[PDB]
Design an enzyme around this catalytic site. Sequence first.
Site: not given
Lengths: 7, 290
Positions: B28-29, B31, B33, B35-36, B98-99, B141
Site C-alpha cells: 500500500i505504500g 517510504g 526505509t 515498503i508498507v 493499520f491506519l 521527519d
Amino acid sequence: SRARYEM
Amino acid sequence: SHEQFRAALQLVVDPGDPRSYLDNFIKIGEGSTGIVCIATVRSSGKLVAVKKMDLRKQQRRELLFNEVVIMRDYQHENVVEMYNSYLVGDELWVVMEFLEGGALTDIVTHTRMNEEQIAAVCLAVLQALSVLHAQGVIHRDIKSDSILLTHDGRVKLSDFGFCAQVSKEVPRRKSLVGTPYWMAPELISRLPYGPEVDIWSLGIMVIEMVDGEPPYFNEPPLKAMKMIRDNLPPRLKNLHKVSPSLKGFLDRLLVRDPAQRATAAELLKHPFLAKAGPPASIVPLMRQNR
C-alpha cells in the site's frame, strides 16, 4: 524537484 | 557485515516469522526505509500493517533500531501502535496498527482543509510531540506523509525510523536527517539541535495543509535547503486564506532562532487550537468519502 524523498 | 548486522537485529526482535499467522500481503505504500503492506490475520480476519525494510538498502543501517526503541518504550493515543518485530531473511518487518484512512498527504494534495480540520490535525500532532519531547525523543521527519488517519478521523504520528534521543548527557543532535523541504534551518546549517526542529517541520506541514505543498517544492532539494537556510521564514502563498489566529499560530512555529520558537507544551495552549473539531470533522476529507 517535488521530492517526497527523505535523507 | 550485512551478516553481522542481521545477527545483531535478531537479538532484539521477536522470534519467528509472521507469515505463519498473516495472509494476503498487499503493498500500500513506500517510504525512504522500505515498503508498507496490509495483511490479514488468519485467525481473526482482522487487518494489520507490515512495514518491510531491507537491511541492505539503508543509508544508515543502525537507525533501524529506532523501530525497536519506540515500540518498546514510547506508545500513546496519537502514535501508531507497533505490535511485534521480526527478522525475515534480509528484511526487518514490523507488524503494526493499520491506519485505514491513509496518509494526510492524500488529503492535502486533493482537497482544501478548513481551519477546524487544520486545528484538529495540529492538536493531535502536538499532543504526541509534547509527550515525546518531554522524554527527549525527536521525531525528525514531521510532514504530511508521516501523519496517518483512522476511518473515523483519529490522527496518529508514524514513521519513527529517523528519530533520535536527547538527554542531559547528549543534549543536542547533529545528524543531517529528514526530508529537505521540511528541514529546520538550524539543522540544514549543521548547528546542534533539539526537539525544536519538529516544531519547525510542523509549521511547514501547516503550509502543506493550506497551500497543498511545502515552500520551494518545485526547486531541486539542495536549492530548497539553501533557500530555507539563508532566507526569512517561508510565507504562505495564500496568506489571505488564513485567519489571523492561524497566522499567529504559524508565526510561533516558523521562527528561525530555535530558542524563540514555541515548544509543543506552549502551543497546546495557543488559542488557534480552540478551533479544533472532533475526529469526525476529518472523515469527509478521506478518499473513500470525498
